[PDB]
Design a protein around this ligand. Structure first.
Ligand SMILES: CCCCCCCCCCCCCCCC(=O)OC[C@H](CO[C@@H]1O[C@H](CS(=O)(=O)O)[C@@H](O)[C@H](O)[C@H]1O)OC(=O)CCCCCCCCCCCCCCC
Ligand SMILES: CCCCCCCCCCCCCCCC(=O)OC[C@H](CO[C@@H]1O[C@H](CS(=O)(=O)O)[C@@H](O)[C@H](O)[C@H]1O)OC(=O)CCCCCCCCCCCCCCC
Ligand SMILES: CCCCCCCCCCCCCCCC(=O)OC[C@H](CO[C@@H]1O[C@H](CS(=O)(=O)O)[C@@H](O)[C@H](O)[C@H]1O)OC(=O)CCCCCCCCCCCCCCC
Ligand SMILES: CCCCCCCCCCCCCCCC(=O)OC[C@H](COP(=O)(O)OC[C@@H](O)CO)OC(=O)CCCCCCCCCCCCCCC
Ligand SMILES: CCCCCCCCCCCCCCCC(=O)OC[C@H](COP(=O)(O)OC[C@@H](O)CO)OC(=O)CCCCCCCCCCCCCCC
Ligand SMILES: CCCCCCCCCCCCCCCC(=O)OC[C@H](COP(=O)(O)OC[C@@H](O)CO)OC(=O)CCCCCCCCCCCCCCC
Ligand SMILES: CCCCCCCCCCCCCCCC(=O)OC[C@H](COP(=O)(O)OC[C@@H](O)CO)OC(=O)CCCCCCCCCCCCCCC
Ligand SMILES: CC1=C(/C=C/C(C)=C/C=C/C(C)=C/C=C/C=C(C)/C=C/C=C(C)/C=C/C2=C(C)CCCC2(C)C)C(C)(C)CCC1
Ligand SMILES: CC1=C(/C=C/C(C)=C/C=C/C(C)=C/C=C/C=C(C)/C=C/C=C(C)/C=C/C2=C(C)CCCC2(C)C)C(C)(C)CCC1
Lengths: 44, 41, 593, 504
């Protein structure tokens, strides 16, 4: 929160929930889709 | 093929002998050189 | 003879043994061995002289006429997959081995007197010996896995050689950028090795060649997958050496000591990316589309470097971009089918480029003796003037190098350049005319450098900057001269530039029958005459533009504003290359965290 | 051959730890305590080496030292010890790492008695885990290491360590929750109620029951070994610690969860292992990708190296499910190389923490102008950590890539996708380790960092520990045939059984 943006990683949207929520659901969606695709693709 | 036992039995006694000889060597934790008990805290 | 070939494996080991001996004692005491500067370098010089004598003996035995030797053994074996490593003895291997050993010996002879004012002297010689040992290991390597091993070793030791003073902030980011630039090509070579071991699995080069030939003949795979694998193989020397996508690491790696760049630019990191494609020639001769795109990206980066290196105020950056332009020539020639001519052009280019970098370092050391520790006021060309009367033989050696890089009379690079242009003219006329304009464009800024560095009136420093020469070096008012140390390799490296021009003629063509691919024409004379004509054009343009001064470049800069400002910085390359990539990686890592 | 060796090697630190509260009067800081503990660790490592070099053979693929002792006529607690092929270098790594961690713990003043007592208590359990060949005594040895490391991280650590220590002990309790259930489930199927290890591998189960047993195994082994849904405990565990406990934290304690992950989930049941092999490979790929992208944006000095443990154990998670002899043989070498790299790196981080009190990468700008041995050792350990071929990390990832390249039942898409993703993973993994060395040392001299704190150049004692830790990695990376012949027959039998069970 306060000790995360002190060097060259300073941006405007870091603790806003509306950005990290869609980023987290996109990451989890690609993780679940990759797991499902590797499960339905292999051994075939 | 190279074995592990004759190259380990010839390297472990000098490893045992050097531990105490480097344990008596110090100089950084001697006079004061530090303000602390040793851990992070 | 046969014990001399059986015992031909400790030659890259003895500089590594000397580096181990130096590094085991440099960290154990660091105050006792720090006083010993001269004999610790004399021992490394004697080891390099023994290695050079062994290299000359092996090259004499190879040119006398024998068989290519091999020695392989099992390395990390398994139940079914067996990996073989060792060393191969080839006439091309000894031909590169004598070049690497002679260049390293002359760089050490230069650094004996170049580092006479730096407290760090023993780690410099230890790192140079480690670089020489890693290059000697990279030369003799029949397996591609140890090619990758010595590739990683060259990348690591170059990362160590860039950061030496650890005081400046540019060399901090330069090594970190060069390591990831080498990591991109390492990724490409790793994907190529994975695909090659997926298709093949015979570890020899000719075995991989005829196994891929039999796999193409009997239909099992698609040629598009082999084309993608060949592009992934070529992606290694794209990012390790200089090409169109990845070439911005070389002006960053230019910053540092001059014997560092004298080994990096000559035959160690420049020649390795060409030697990787040289060992993969029966793999690449099967399909021609990868050869066409290799020649096209080589001609493109050769055209790009010539337009970059015109409006450059630094001497070493312009020399590095001319090295990029010659890399474009040899990569395009290797893509066309000028393989032996490309290897001879690489040998000639290294032969005059090591001498040219040593002369540039001598000029830089003289200006360091004149102008103080500010590097931006030392490597600039606005202060260079009237250096011919103070450096007669150094100026003559630089004139010999700057004339042999053009070669409008028959010289060393003359026959190789006309053979390259004849191969491209047999391939494609558009790339031939592009390289014909590029050969005059490089001679333009070459003679611009020659007429702005030495010849002219003596120009001093304006009073807005500091004027003192007693910061951390010797006290001298006039531009002095190196007595005996730096003057020796500049006259040693003169006679090969005379010898290889007459020894590599197309009439006898001993290099074609000496180095062959594993399997009198008047048009050649008129392409050579066109090359001499455009070289004379470049000489007559760059002569009176800077000596007489009637076509002043200030009116030319006021004439064309956007074409000058687009190529002024570099070419507007890095401000697009690093910015959005670093910001996207930072935003992605921030979102992940 | 008729003498018990591993039992006395396990029981000797537990007996010798009773002399730590005795301690005739030193009148000082506690130097006879560490001088006795170092000698105890030295003679224990000497006994380990003398027991390894004489009785351990390289011909029998089973167990050379087989010693069984009837503890009780009850449930089936039986002191049956046995050394295998892929477990014999683990004990020699355990003793070496614990001996150098004992030797590295010189500046201990606040309570050294309980420190060295818990050290000698954990050294017994770290051999009792790898030396046992039971189902219930293995869970007992797994829960034996619950209290001492948690107590050490409680009594000293960084800031807000009380929030991390309770989370660590509750995570270890949640890990140990499923082990007893998954051990009793395979033992209570049918008959032969006794808990012998050789009889549990010959039993036959149903398909859904084996799937449930493999799920109960994989939940505990994903809690223990850090994967991307269950790695939130590891920054709080491995960032808030001191060096001599962090050596054992980042060394053999992470390989303990990977050794059992092979030995149970391949030998006990390989039928359900193939159905979760692409899931485990994809999870290791996502681990390798996520660790570097998390550690690059981090500003803490110790979590930046703690996520490298995840980035290096993702290679083991890839190489476990490769179904190849070379891919199985490279995992033990990768574990040994990762332990020998991470112990040296975290000892070096804990050593340089005492010279500069602030753990921020921004203020550390001019620490390299005075001390040069520290910068040289950091550069050498980092270059050993990234991709170098003289060290055995490149040889281990090359073995993983070669064993995964020639596989079966993943023909067209899976091998090229996993290889292309691990390639960008090894693109991403040196970035933060390069940026840390670029930001800390390479730069101008900070005046306030010298005015506030004064740093002293390193001892020749600190050179000796890194010189002892760096030479086996170079010795393995230069000649990888030394570790191959130790477990070649065991890995061949394991891959032969796994290919006999797997059809087509
Ligand atoms: C016609 C099409 C042509 C396409 C061409 C494609 C080219 C691809 C290769 C591009 C290589 C660029 C190298 C840049 C290196 C650099 O900026 O400095 C080095 C930086 C340092 O950054 C930071 O740099 C800071 C210093 S400074 O900013 O550099 O000054 C430093 O302080 C900090 O620690 C550090 O984090 O390193 C980075 O972290 C990023 C390195 C580049 C990342 C490589 C992955 C990119 C993959 C491309 C995917 C392509 C997608 C399409 C696929 C077909
Ligand atoms: C998938 C398999 C999972 C297996 C593991 C789960 C097995 C069952 C566990 C049983 C649940 C335990 C309940 C009791 C917890 C409690 O007492 O907390 C009390 C403490 C005190 O809190 C802290 O305490 C501090 C004060 S002090 O430390 O206590 O003194 C205070 O400062 C601070 O504010 C406060 O936060 O809380 C913590 O330390 C947080 C850790 C709690 C551990 C709960 C484990 C449950 C994990 C669920 C699975 C996660 C899955 C992730 C993937 C989706
Ligand atoms: C198989 C592959 C193996 C790869 C191994 C990779 C090793 C990488 C090491 C990188 C170290 C970077 C340090 C840069 C210099 C520095 O700042 O510290 C400088 C200090 C000197 O101290 C001090 O140095 C000062 C000089 S100055 O500050 O640098 O100017 C001096 O003034 C002072 O008196 C003195 O105290 O450190 C030293 O130079 C000690 C030597 C370390 C160099 C290692 C040499 C590598 C040999 C390779 C051996 C291969 C082994 C093969 C096995 C079969
Ligand atoms: C470019 C590439 C260059 C790579 C070169 C690297 C070569 C590395 C290969 C190593 C494998 C060697 C196997 C040969 C070994 C071999 O074949 O002989 C083994 C031989 C065993 O002798 P016998 O077989 O006669 O013994 C029988 C008895 O041992 C029975 O008990 O003697 C040894 O044990 C030598 C002692 C170990 C010596 C270790 C040398 C290294 C010591 C380094 C100490 C650290 C230095 C630190 C400095 C700070
Ligand atoms: C099981 C084995 C695992 C591998 C462990 C490897 C052990 C290798 C450790 C050696 C690295 C030493 C780094 C010390 C370097 C260092 O930091 O200390 C430096 C130390 C002297 O330091 P000073 O105290 O003078 O400090 C310097 C200050 O004075 C500054 O001016 O040198 C020594 O006396 C040790 C010299 C090494 C001597 C090595 C002898 C090896 C003998 C081997 C005999 C072999 C017999 C073979 C028979 C076949
Ligand atoms: C695909 C995108 C390409 C965009 C870039 C375009 C590259 C195209 C190539 C253009 C050349 C470089 C122009 C920029 C390069 C540039 O801006 O610097 C050219 C340079 C300008 O002077 P300097 O850069 O030395 O000046 C520095 C001062 O201006 C500082 O105040 O000198 C010229 O004006 C000489 C040109 C005479 C050329 C005519 C000579 C006749 C040649 C022989 C006749 C045969 C025809 C052969 C073909 C010419
Ligand atoms: C098999 C062991 C597995 C680990 C279990 C141990 C849990 C940790 C012990 C509880 C904390 C005890 C603090 C007591 C406080 C105490 O009485 O001593 C307090 C005493 C005070 O010494 P210090 O010099 O630290 O005093 C503080 C001074 O520094 C003043 O500032 O510390 C020691 O000497 C520790 C001695 C070890 C004491 C623990 C011995 C436990 C023996 C039994 C172990 C189990 C046997 C199981 C069957 C084999
Ligand atoms: C030959 C050549 C070339 C080439 C170039 C280059 C060199 C390029 C580069 C390359 C590269 C540079 C590559 C890369 C790529 C890759 C990728 C694209 C990756 C991916 C990634 C990812 C995937 C991530 C993400 C994620 C997350 C978020 C988390 C975890 C999971 C995941 C992983 C999913 C060209 C054509 C130009 C032309 C000239 C010549
Ligand atoms: C105990 C153990 C082991 C071992 C074994 C072996 C095998 C050993 C050794 C081996 C070998 C046979 C090795 C050796 C060789 C090599 C060398 C000898 C190297 C060198 C190095 C050096 C000496 C250097 C140093 C340095 C540097 C480089 C720089 C910086 C600083 C320093 C110091 C780091 C094993 C594995 C089982 C595992 C477990 C544990």
């Amino acid at each position: 929160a306060t000790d995360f943006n002190r060097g060259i990683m300073k941006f405007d949207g870091a603790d806003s929930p509306a950005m990290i929520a869609i980023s987290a659901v996109l990451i989890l969606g690609f993780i679940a889709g990759l797991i499902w695709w590797a499960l339905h693709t292999a051994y075939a | 093929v190279i074995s592990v036992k004759p190259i380990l039995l010839a390297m472990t006694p000098v490893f045992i002998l050097l531990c105490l000889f480097f344990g008596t060597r110090n100089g950084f934790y001697d006079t004061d050189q530090y303000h602390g008990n040793g851990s992070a805290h | 003879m046969e014990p001399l070939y059986q015992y031909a494996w400790l030659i890259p080991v003895l500089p590594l043994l000397g580096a181990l001996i130096v590094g085991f004692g440099l960290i154990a005491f660091s105050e006792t061995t720090s006083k010993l500067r001269r004999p610790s370098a004399i021992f490394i010089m004697a080891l390099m002289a023994i290695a050079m004598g062994h290299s000359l003996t092996l090259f004499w035995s190879q040119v006398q006429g024998h068989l290519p030797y091999t020695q392989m053994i099992e390395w990390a074996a398994a139940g079914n997959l067996h990996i073989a490593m060792g060393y191969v003895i080839d006439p091309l291997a000894a031909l590169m081995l004598v070049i690497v050993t002679t260049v390293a010996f002359l760089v050490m002879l230069y650094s004996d007197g170049y580092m006479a004012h730096d407290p760090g002297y023993v780690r410099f010689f230890a790192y140079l010996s480690l670089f020489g040992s890693s290059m000697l290991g990279l030369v003799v390597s029949p397996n591609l896995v140890q090619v990758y091993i010595f590739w990683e070793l060259v990348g690591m030791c170059s990362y160590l050689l860039i950061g030496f003073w650890y005081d400046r902030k540019s060399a901090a980011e330069a090594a970190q950028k060069a390591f990831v630039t080498n990591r991109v090509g390492d990724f490409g070579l790793l994907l190529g090795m994975v695909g090659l071991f997926w298709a093949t699995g015979t570890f020899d080069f000719a075995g991989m060649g005829d196994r891929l030939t039999e796999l193409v003949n009997t239909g099992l795979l698609s040629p598009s997958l082999a084309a993608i694998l060949a592009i992934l193989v070529f992606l290694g020397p794209v990012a390790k050496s200089a090409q169109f996508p990845l070439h911005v690491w070389l002006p960053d790696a230019m910053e540092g000591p001059t014997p560092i760049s004298a080994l990096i630019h000559a035959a160690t990191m420049v020649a390795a990316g060409v030697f990787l494609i040289a060992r993969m020639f029966p793999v690449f001769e099967q399909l021609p589309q990868v050869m066409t795109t290799i020649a096209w990206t080589g001609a493109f980066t050769a055209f790009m470097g010539a337009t970059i290196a015109i409006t450059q105020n630094d001497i070493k950056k312009s020399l590095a971009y001319s090295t990029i332009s010659q890399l474009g020539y040899m990569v395009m020639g290797m893509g066309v089918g000028a393989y032996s001519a490309g290897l001879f052009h690489l040998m000639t280019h290294a032969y005059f480029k090591a001498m040219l970098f040593l002369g540039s370092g001598s000029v830089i050391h003289s200006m360091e003796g004149v102008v103080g520790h500010n590097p931006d006021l030392a490597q600039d060309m606005r202060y260079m003037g009237g250096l011919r009367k103070y450096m007669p033989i150094t100026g003559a050696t630089f004139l010999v190098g700057c004339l042999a890089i053009s070669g409008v009379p028959p010289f060393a690079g003359f026959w190789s350049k006309d053979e390259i242009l004849g191969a491209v003219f047999h391939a494609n006329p558009a790339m031939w005319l592009l390289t014909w304009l590029t050969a005059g464009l490089t001679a333009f800024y070459m003679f611009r450098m020659y007429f702005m560095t030495f010849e002219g009136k003596f120009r001093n420093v304006p009073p807005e900057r500091q004027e003192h020469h007693d910061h951390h070096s010797h006290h001298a008012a006039v531009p002095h001269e190196s007595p005996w140390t730096m003057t020796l390799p500049l006259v040693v490296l003169a006679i090969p530039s005379t010898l290889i021009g007459f020894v590599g003629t197309p009439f006898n063509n001993l290099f074609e029958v000496f180095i062959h691919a594993p399997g009198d024409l008047t048009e050649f004379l008129i392409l050579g005459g066109s090359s001499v004509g455009i070289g004379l054009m470049g000489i007559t343009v760059a002569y009176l533009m800077y000596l007489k001064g009637t076509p002043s470049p200030q009116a030319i800069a006021k004439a064309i504003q956007p074409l000058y400002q687009f190529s002024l910085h570099k070419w507007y390359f890095d401000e697009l290359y690093e910015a959005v990539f670093i910001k996207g990686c930072r935003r992605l890592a921030r979102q992940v965290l | 051959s008729t003498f018990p060796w591993l039992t006395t090697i396990i029981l000797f630190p537990i007996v010798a730890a009773l002399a730590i509260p005795f301690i005739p009067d030193p009148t000082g800081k506690g130097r006879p305590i560490r001088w006795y503990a170092l000698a105890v660790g030295l003679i224990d490592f000497a006994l380990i080496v003398y027991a390894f070099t004489n009785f351990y053979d390289l011909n029998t693929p089973g167990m050379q030292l087989w010693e069984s002792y009837d503890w009780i006529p009850e449930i089936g607690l039986r002191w049956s010890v046995g050394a295998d092929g892929l477990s014999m270098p683990l004990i020699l790594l355990t003793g070496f790492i614990t001996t150098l961690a004992i030797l590295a713990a010189w500046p201990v003043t606040l309570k050294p008695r309980l420190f060295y007592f818990l050290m000698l208590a954990m050294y017994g359990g770290q051999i009792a885990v790898f030396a046992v060949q039971d189902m219930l005594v293995f869970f007992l040895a797994w829960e034996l290491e619950l209290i001492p490391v948690y107590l050490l991280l409680a009594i000293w650590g960084g800031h807000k360590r009380q929030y991390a220590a309770t989370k660590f002990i509750l995570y270890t309790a949640g890990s140990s929750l499923f082990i007893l259930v998954a051990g009793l489930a395979m033992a209570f199927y049918g008959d032969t109620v006794s808990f012998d290890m050789q009889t549990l591998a010959a039993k036959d189960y149903a398909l859904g029951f084996q799937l449930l047993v493999y799920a109960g195994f994989l939940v505990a082994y994903g809690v223990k070994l850090p994967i991307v849904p269950l790695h939130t405990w590891l920054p709080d565990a491995h960032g808030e610690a001191t060096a001599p406990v962090h050596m054992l934290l980042a060394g053999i304690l992470l390989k303990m969860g990977g050794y059992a992950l092979i030995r149970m989930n391949v030998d006990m049941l390989p039928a359900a292992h193939a159905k979760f092999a692409p899931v485990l490979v994809i999870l290791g790929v996502v681990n390798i990708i996520y660790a570097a992208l998390t550690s690059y944006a981090q500003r803490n000095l110790k979590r930046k190296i703690a996520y490298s443990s995840i980035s290096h154990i993702g290679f083991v998670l890839i190489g476990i499910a490769s179904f190849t002899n070379l891919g199985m043989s490279g995992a033990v070498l990768q574990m040994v190389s990762h332990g020998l790299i991470g112990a040296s790196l975290f000892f070096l981080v804990g050593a340089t923490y005492d010279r500069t009190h602030t753990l921020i990468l921004e203020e550390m700008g001019g620490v390299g102008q005075k001390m040069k041995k520290i910068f040289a050792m950091f550069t050498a350990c980092s270059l050993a950590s990234l991709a170098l071929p003289g060290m055995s990390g490149f040889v281990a990832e090359l073995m993983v890539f070669i064993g995964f390249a020639t596989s079966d039942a993943y023909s067209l898409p899976f091998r090229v996708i996993v290889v292309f993703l691990a390639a960008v993973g090894v693109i991403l993994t040196p970035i933060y380790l390069l940026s840390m060395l670029r930001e800390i040392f390479y730069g101008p001299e900070n005046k306030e960092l010298v005015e506030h704190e004064a740093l002293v150049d390193a001892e020749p004692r600190e050179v000796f520990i890194i010189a002892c830790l760096l030479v086996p990695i170079i010795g393995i990376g230069l000649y990888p045939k030394l570790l191959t012949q130790i477990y070649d027959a065991t890995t061949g039998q394991v891959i032969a059984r796994a290919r006999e069970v797997l059809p087509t």
